[PDB]
Design a protein around this ligand. Structure first.
Ligand code: NA
Length: 297
C-alpha cells in the first residue's frame, strides 16, 4: 500500500436506491429496519470490492435532495421532471427517503467511512470536487458507480471506475469526453430538465403542446468543444447567454467556489468514528447476523 493511500469514492445513494427498487415491493410501507439492512448489506459488498482492488480509504458520497439542489436555486426547473415521476408511483418513496436519512446519520455516528452528506448537494458534486483534490495530492482513485458518467474527469491521472451493476470497468478517458460534455451544455440534458441553448431555459418544464427544440449542427458542438472561445463566435448572444447558464448546470469546473469549498471543508473537518462503535451499533440496531462480521466493514 502507498504513502498517499488509494481512495475509493462510492456513488452510494444510487447503488442503494437501485437495490431498493428491486428488493422492496410496491404498495408496502418501507420502514427503518428494511432500509438499514439494505444499506449495510450494500456497504459490506462494495467495501470488500474496494479493499481487494487495493483502496483502503472509503468515502461514501450521498445524494441529499431533502431541500432540493443548489443547482435548482440557480435554475428553478432543474430536475423537476424527476419529482413529478415519484408523485404518481405506488412505491413508498416517502418512507424510503425518511428512513435513508436516519440511516445516513447512523453511518456518520458509528461507521468508519467519510460520509459526504450535505442537504442540497449531489453525490456527483462530492465526487467531482474530491477527485480534483485527491488527484492533485497524488492519491490513486477508485470511483464505484454503476452508471455514473465521470468522463469529465478524464484529465486527472490514476482515476478508475468500477460498475457494480454491470460488473465491469467504466471508461473515464473516453476519447470524446469534451465533445460529450459540450453536447449536454449546448443541446441540453432532458433527463435533468436541462434545455438546449436555442430555447428558453425552463423549456422542459414549461413546454406547450406542439413546441419543438430547433436543431443544432454537430459541427458547432465539435467546434466549441475543441475551442470554447468559439462560443462567442458561433452562437448568437441569446444562445451564448444560455450557454453560460448551462455551464453551471453541467460542467464540474463551474461548481461555484462556495459550494466546492463547503465540500472540501466538510471532508477536512469530518469526525471519523473509532472502529469500536461498529459493534455497539450493530447490537443496538439488532443486526445480530452482522456482529459476526465486524471485520468486513
Ligand atoms: Na462516519
Amino acid at each position: 500500500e502507498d504513502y498517499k493511500e488509494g481512495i475509493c469514492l462510492i456513488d452510494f445513494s444510487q447503488i442503494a436506491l437501485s437495490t431498493a427498487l428491486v428488493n422492496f415491493p410496491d404498495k408496502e410501507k418501507i420502514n427503518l429496519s428494511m432500509v438499514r439492512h439494505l444499506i449495510l448489506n450494500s456497504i459490506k459488498f462494495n467495501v470488500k470490492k474496494a479493499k481487494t482492488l487495493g483502496y483502503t480509504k472509503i468515502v461514501l458520497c450521498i445524494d441529499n435532495a431533502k431541500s432540493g439542489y443548489w443547482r435548482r436555486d440557480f435554475a428553478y426547473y432543474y430536475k423537476k421532471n424527476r419529482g413529478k415521476a415519484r408523485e404518481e408511483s405506488t412505491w413508498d418513496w416517502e418512507g424510503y427517503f425518511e428512513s435513508s436519512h436516519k440511516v445516513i446519520d447512523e453511518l456518520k455516528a458509528y461507521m468508519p467511512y467519510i460520509v459526504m452528506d450535505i442537504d442540497k448537494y449531489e453525490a456527483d458534486d462530492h465526487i467531482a470536487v474530491l477527485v480534483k483534490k485527491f488527484s492533485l495530492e497524488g492519491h490513486k482513485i477508485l470511483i464505484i458507480s454503476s452508471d455514473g458518467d465521470f468522463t469529465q474527469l478524464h484529465k486527472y491521472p490514476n482515476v478508475k471506475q468500477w460498475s457494480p451493476m454491470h460488473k465491469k470497468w467504466v471508461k473515464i478517458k473516453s476519447g470524446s469526453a469534451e465533445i460529450d460534455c459540450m453536447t449536454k451544455i449546448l443541446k441540453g440534458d432532458k433527463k435533468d430538465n436541462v434545455a438546449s441553448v436555442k430555447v428558453r431555459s425552463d423549456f422542459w418544464f414549461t413546454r406547450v403542446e406542439g413546441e419543438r427544440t430547433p436543431s443544432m449542427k454537430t459541427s458547432i458542438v465539435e467546434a466549441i468543444a475543441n475551442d470554447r472561445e468559439q462560443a462567442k463566435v458561433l452562437l448568437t448572444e441569446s444562445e451564448y447567454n444560455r450557454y453560460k447558464e448551462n455551464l453551471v448546470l453541467i460542467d464540474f469546473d463551474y461548481i461555484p467556489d462556495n459550494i466546492a469549498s463547503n465540500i472540501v471543508n466538510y471532508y477536512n473537518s469530518y469526525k471519523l468514528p473509532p472502529r469500536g462503535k461498529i459493534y455497539s451499533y450493530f447490537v443496538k440496531a439488532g443486526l445480530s447476523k452482522l456482529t459476526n462480521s465486524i471485520n468486513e466493514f
